[PDB]
Design a protein around this ligand. Structure first.
Ligand code: IPD
Ligand code: IPD
Ligand code: CA
Ligand code: CA
Ligand code: CA
Ligand code: CA
Ligand code: CA
Ligand code: CL
Ligand code: CL
Lengths: 273, 273
């Protein structure tokens, strides 16, 4: 079957931004590395990709609300006000600036606050993860399902490191989580792009994933992908506010629950709210 | 063209093995891999890729010695006895068997025990890292240089987690190492194929890399890549027995030096000085 029109618009915007990013990494040097925060980089490439995405989206839907990582939140109008696009124009910026070919464009659409459409596009490997609510998820058109692994034994987990200065107070907490997972699992991977970690959970390439400190645009599309592939997503307390709180556990049925339980004893009260 | 004939032979062998591995991953992605069947699938693909490589190598140099991960060590004859091929037919097998598209073929040639030729091939992204002693290193034909970063400030490091049972007593040491690096660096990455981690050091994509528990076929090609790109490679004590001891630091000049210094306080004072 073919995609709903809105998912199609999102996918074409993602493709255009990804071709810009790929042209950059392939043949150019980065000519702008500003710094939004410490270790939080913004490039001419991030802004150009964001402008590409927003131009396509507003060409199709001028009354929708837009929340871009670089541009912030801009409300819509009329009926269009119930639609909110959540855009990471380039997820994996540190990878990108170093030339590490692992990063993605991430675009989600929420209707009345509920995830409705999702695109995660890796323009190097040309991998297009798409999903719509109640429609399943797909990689380049083929339907995705979370893995069948029944426990953490032999699992391949994805994760993200608490690298920011303002996370130092939780670093040891995280390293304890990590520690208790090394024995049973087959491996833990930190490839450096949260949207692709979620997409990999959705495709069955990772059995589960956990990270704190994330922003909404990092997670929105990938969370819809995981949900539509038959998986589970929550925050560190098991509730549905992972987008607002920035801590997230995603995974297949049993590995999600097992990882959530496993991280429980190493949670600071700041991540138990 | 510019490659010495021995390097070109190794490159074509890597290409054929990588095409085989790529078709294999494509077929495993559309079927459910039993946990009992995963090891058998991996042994199959491993041995088929090794056969591909070894047939191609011996068609050109039948008197050379061969050392494959799957097949062990087989001596050569005549002057060919001074040539030893060190082959990992599939670096990143846990990724592979989970469908994570990050893995590579690794082929090195040693002449009287010194690294002479090297190929690391990513068959998904189609990235061919090549080097010969005294000839420099290339990615798909373009010359490679290690990065110029002067310290670990803002550095992107590669690493490999100590996931094996026999590394358990080192786990804490590793997590101590890791911890001391979080403040300065912009990120740490564990993508799951040590040959590609070394190749990324050589291309300037990582500023430095460290890991222990490796085997010779994991490191041989990538170490030559780093050296020929202008970088530095050593074991944890700073000597050049990384191939034999299994622990390795590689980097650009300054980040190699800083990373080696950083890891010294977390070394068991004995075998590792
Ligand atoms: O900065 P960015 O590259 O857009 O987005 C994120 C990346 O997905 C990274 O994998 C994650 O670990 C960081 O927490 C985020 O910053
Ligand atoms: O078994 P393999 O996948 O061929 O090689 C792996 C090594 O065993 C190493 O321990 C791991 O950290 C690397 O990511 C891979 O190179
Ligand atoms: Ca960011
Ligand atoms: Ca991101
Ligand atoms: Ca971003
Ligand atoms: Ca291997
Ligand atoms: Ca290997
Ligand atoms: Cl691991
Ligand atoms: Cl990091």
């Amino acid at each position: 079957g073919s995609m709903q029109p809105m998912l199609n618009i999102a996918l074409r915007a993602a493709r255009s931004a990804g071709e810009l990013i790929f042209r950059s990494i392939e043949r150019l040097d980065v000519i702008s590395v500003n710094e939004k925060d410490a270790k939080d980089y913004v490039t001419e490439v991030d802004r150009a990709a964001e402008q590409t995405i927003v131009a396509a989206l507003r060409k199709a839907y001028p009354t929708h609300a837009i929340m871009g990582e670089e541009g912030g939140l801009i409300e819509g109008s009329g009926e269009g006000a119930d639609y909110l696009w959540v855009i990471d124009p380039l997820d994996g910026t540190t990878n990108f600036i170093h030339g590490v070919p692992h990063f993605a464009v991430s675009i989600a659409c929420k209707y009345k606050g509920r995830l409705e459409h999702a695109v995660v596009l890796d323009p190097v490997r040309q991998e297009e993860f798409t999903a719509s609510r109640g429609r399943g998820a797909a990689l380049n058109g083929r339907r995705l399902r979370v893995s069948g692994r029944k426990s953490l034994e032999g699992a391949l987990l994805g994760t993200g490191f608490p690298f920011r200065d303002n996370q130092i107070d939780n670093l040891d907490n995280y390293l304890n989580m990590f520690r208790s997972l090394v024995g049973q699992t087959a491996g833990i991977r930190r490839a450096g792009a949260a949207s692709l970690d979620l997409a990999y959970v959705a495709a069955g390439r990772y059995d589960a994933f956990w990270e704190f400190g994330l922003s909404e645009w990092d997670m929105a599309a990938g969370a819809l992908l995981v949900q539509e592939a038959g998986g589970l997503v929550s925050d560190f307390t098991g509730s549905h506010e992972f987008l607002e709180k920035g801590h997230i556990v995603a995974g297949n049925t049993k590995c999600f629950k097992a990882l959530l339980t496993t991280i429980q004893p190493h949670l600071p009260p700041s991540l138990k709210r």
